[PDB]
């Protein structure tokens, strides 16, 4: 039968059950890694860790009263931690709206617990958000910064797979994936390299600070601890391409194509990445170096509907040509 599709039947069941379409259609699962790599370049370990946890939960091998999976993502800023959480929410649960992000730098000071589970009588951000979306990826950023009382509420989710809010009713977390992140150790490494410490001292200092914040009792609850890597030059080039996709899409609406020389792509990659911020500068580099002078060319009619535009490097920056 060809007229009524899988998605039609999943959609009706989803609307009636609250179970996301992609969850109901999970099996119709082996490809999860390939799907995640559509958006996340490199960080293969992270992707496999996440996919393995999900496979174990689906195969009935894990505790049904704990979340689907829980991870700590260590390593530097701007190399894919958030992109993977987003991509995982969109993939498992059909939208990025299914990613709940919590910045622990906003939960350092004691009363912040109320902000999470609700003020004491006389609701909470998290508990309300998870009540209404039980199928969600929950991203806690900079977990070491959490006030201890906030830290303990996370431990309850890991241990119990649920929370009781201030109203005294349970909120279910058994269908969540928990991703914790921390930058710890990364500025210390750069500081060591700047001050010319020996590898020995750099390593010892990183281990000290990790031991200080993350104890076995905590770490043992997680499916995996993953250390994200810095990105290679090639990986940044592939990210540049991903970040040009929407621009190409808009250009193609006027049948304009963009043909970047290798030097051009490397020009954007070099400017759009650094050790401190990872690939976070890349978006505005593209905007300033490519989209703005291209806009000018189009508005002057030097670039026209149908044109194929070679983008190269000139002295002042990127240069544009049409054959
Ligand atoms: N591994 C990666 N794969 C694809 N895109 C990436 C990757 N790492 C970084 N990016 C891109 O650069 C940005 C990195 O910043 P962000 O997601 O804010 O990093 P963080 O995980 O530190 O929050 C993303 O918005 C994304 O477009």
Residue numbers in the entry: 518 to 545, 549 to 642, 649 to 849
The authors write:
The molecular chaperone ClpB, the bacterial homologue of Hsp104, is a disaggregation machine that provides thermotolerance by resolubilizing and reactivating aggregated proteins in concert with the DnaK (Hsp70) chaperone system. ClpB belongs to the family of AAA+ proteins (ATPases associated with various cellular activities) that comprises a wide range of molecular machines which utilize the energy from ATP hydrolysis to remodel their respective substrates. The AAA+ disaggregation machines Hsp104 and ClpB possess two NBDs per monomer, thus forming double-ring structures with 12 potential ATPase sites in the active hexameric complex. We determined high-resolution X-ray structures in different nucleotide states for one of the motor subunits, namely NBD2, of ClpB and combined the structural analysis with nucleotide-binding kinetics studies.
In addition to the AMPPCP-bound structure of ClpB NBD2 R621Q in the presence of MgCl2 and GdmCl, we also obtained the structure of this mutant variant in the ADP-bound state to a resolution of 2.1 Å. The mutant variant NBD2 R621Q is nucleotide-binding competent, but shows an approximately 30-fold reduced ATPase activity. Since the R621Q mutation selectively impairs ADP binding, we conclude that in the ADP state Arg621 contributes significantly to the nucleotide-binding energy, presumably by mimicking the nucleotide-associated Mg2+. In the ATP state, the Arg806 side chain must adopt an alternative conformation because otherwise it would clash with the γ-­phosphate. Indeed, Arg806 is located about 4 Å away from the nucleotide in the AMPPCP-bound structure. This is in agreement with our nucleotide-binding data, which show that the sensor 2 mutation R806A causes significantly impaired ADP binding but almost no change in ATP binding.
